[PDB]
Structures are given as structure tokens and as C-alpha cells.
Amino acid sequence: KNIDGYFKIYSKHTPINLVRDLPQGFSALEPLVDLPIGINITRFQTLL
Amino acid sequence: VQLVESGGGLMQAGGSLRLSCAVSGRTFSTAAMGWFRQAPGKEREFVAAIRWSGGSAYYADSVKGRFTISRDKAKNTVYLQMNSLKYEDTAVYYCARTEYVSYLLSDYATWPYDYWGQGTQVTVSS
Amino acid sequence: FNCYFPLQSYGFQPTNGVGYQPYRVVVLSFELLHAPATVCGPKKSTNLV
Numbered sequence: 001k002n003i004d005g006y007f008k009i010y011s012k013h014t015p016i017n018l019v020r021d022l023p024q025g026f027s028a029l030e031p032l033v034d035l036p037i038g039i040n041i042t043r044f045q046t047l048l
Numbered sequence: 049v050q051l052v053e054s055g056g057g058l059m060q061a062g063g064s065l066r067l068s069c070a071v072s073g074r075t076f077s078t079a080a081m082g083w084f085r086q087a088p089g090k091e092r093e094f095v096a097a098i099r100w101s102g103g104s105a106y107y108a109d110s111v112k113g114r115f116t117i118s119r120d121k122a123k124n125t126v127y128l129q130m131n132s133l134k135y136e137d138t139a140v141y142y143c144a145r146t147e148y149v150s151y152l153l154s155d156y157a158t159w160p161y162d163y164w165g166q167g168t169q170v171t172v173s174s
Numbered sequence: 175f176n177c178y179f180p181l182q183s184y185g186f187q188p189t190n191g192v193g194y195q196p197y198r199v200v201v202l203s204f205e206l207l208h209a210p211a212t213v214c215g216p217k218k219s220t221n222l223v
């Protein structure tokens with residue numbers, strides 16, 4: 001997310017055994033990164 | 049920093065020769081290049097100058113309409129195209145370089161240059 | 175004539191007058207945009223009791 005110029009990145013890694021779809025359950029994401037960019041964002045894309 | 053001259057030599061009057069002068073070694077900047085000449089027993093004398101930036105040229109009266117100075121920045125080389133050769137053109141020709149930037153091109157006729165080539169003989173025959 | 179090169183060199187010699195000798199100059203300008211302030215000072219800490 002991007003709020004008042006700061007880019008907040010939270011993340012969480014877990015093991016799973018579930019090819020078909022998202023696992024049902026509950027888990028919280030701890031913050032990892034806080035970037036003082038002050039950059040506008042309205043679009044994004046992924047790189048594999 | 050070295051100035052390496054080439055070309056010239058013997059040519060019959062009315063003919064054309066081209067002198068080259070290549071600059072080797074690390075330079076910070078070049079303001080202008082020039083050609084001078086010294087005939088036996090005579091004082092060394094200005095021939096032509098060229099500003100490295102823009103390529104504007106300044107000529108001694110004695111060579112106007114006959115000689116052309118030119119520059120190849122990428123090859124770090126100055127040239128003197130010597131057309132309509134006369135006996136009076138017989139001399140050792142010297143390449144010169146300066147980092148001194150004058151607003152006034154005509155200053156290159158009288159400015160003491162910092163770097164000098166070894167000199168190349170031009171001999172004009174009948 | 176009436177056509178000159180806009181730039182000219184400096185005559186910086188070791189023997190030149192102080193007025194004509196070279197001087198290195200840095201100008202520090204500060205900016206406050208609609209963005210986070212990312213250039214902050216030390217704010218030195220004190221011992222814990």
C-alpha cells in the first residue's frame with residue numbers, strides 16, 4: 001500500500017500442501033519494508 | 049600528451065598536400081589546435097587555428113583562400129589542406145594545442161601554445 | 175566580428191593573487207515537497223538510567 005508518500009510492504013511465508021486453491025485458515029502479515037518514495041502509483045504488474 | 053604530425057613532403061608548385069596531427073594520451077580538454085611554420089633562417093610564424101568546439105577557423109593573411117584547417121574530434125586529429133602551393137610555403141610545419149579558451153578566436157594567432165609536435169617538412173618545387 | 179565564443183578560461187596559477195586564486199564552492203539548498211523528509215540529522219542520544 002501507498003499512504004502519504006510511504007510505501008508499506010508486509011509479507012508472510014508459510015508451508016502448504018494445496019495445488020488446487022488458497023488454503024482456508026488465518027495468518028497475519030508482519031511488516032517488512034517502509035519506503036519513503038513520495039511516488040504516485042495507480043498501476044502495477046508482476047515479473048516472473 | 050603527444051602531438052604526432054604526418055603527411056607533407058615534396059610537391060610541385062600549384063599542387064596540394066594535406067598535413068595531419070594526431071593527439072595521443074589522456075587530455076582533460078582541448079580548446080584549440082593550430083598550425084605554425086618555420087622557413088630556414090626565419091622566425092616561426094602562425095598559419096591557422098581552429099576552435100575544437102564549433103570548428104571556427106582563423107587564418108594568417110598569407111594562406112587565406114589557399115589553406116583549410118579542419119578537425120575530427122572523434123579521431124582527436126587536426127588537418128591542414130595546403131592547396132595552390134607556392135615556393136614561399138616551403139618550411140617545417142608544426143602542430144600546436146592549447147586548453148586555453150578565449151572568447152576571441154583571433155587570440156589563437158598570438159597565444160603561446162602549451163604543446164607542440166616534432167615538425168613536418170613541406171618542400172615546394174618548380 | 176560581433177560573433178564570439180560565450181565561454182572563457184580561468185587563469186589559475188599558484189602565484190596568482192588570492193582574489194584571482196581558485197576557490198571551491200558548495201551551495202546547500204533544502205527542499206520540502208509533498209513527500210516524506212528523508213534527510214534528517216543525528217539527534218544524539220544519552221545514557222539510560
Ligand SMILES: *[C@@H]1O[C@H](CO)[C@@H](O)[C@H](O)[C@H]1NC(C)=O
Nearest residue numbers: 038039040041042043208209
Ligand atoms: C498523483 O495522482 C493524483 C490523483 O489523480 C493526481 O491528482 C496528481 O496530479 C498526481 N500527481 C502526479 C505526481 O502526477
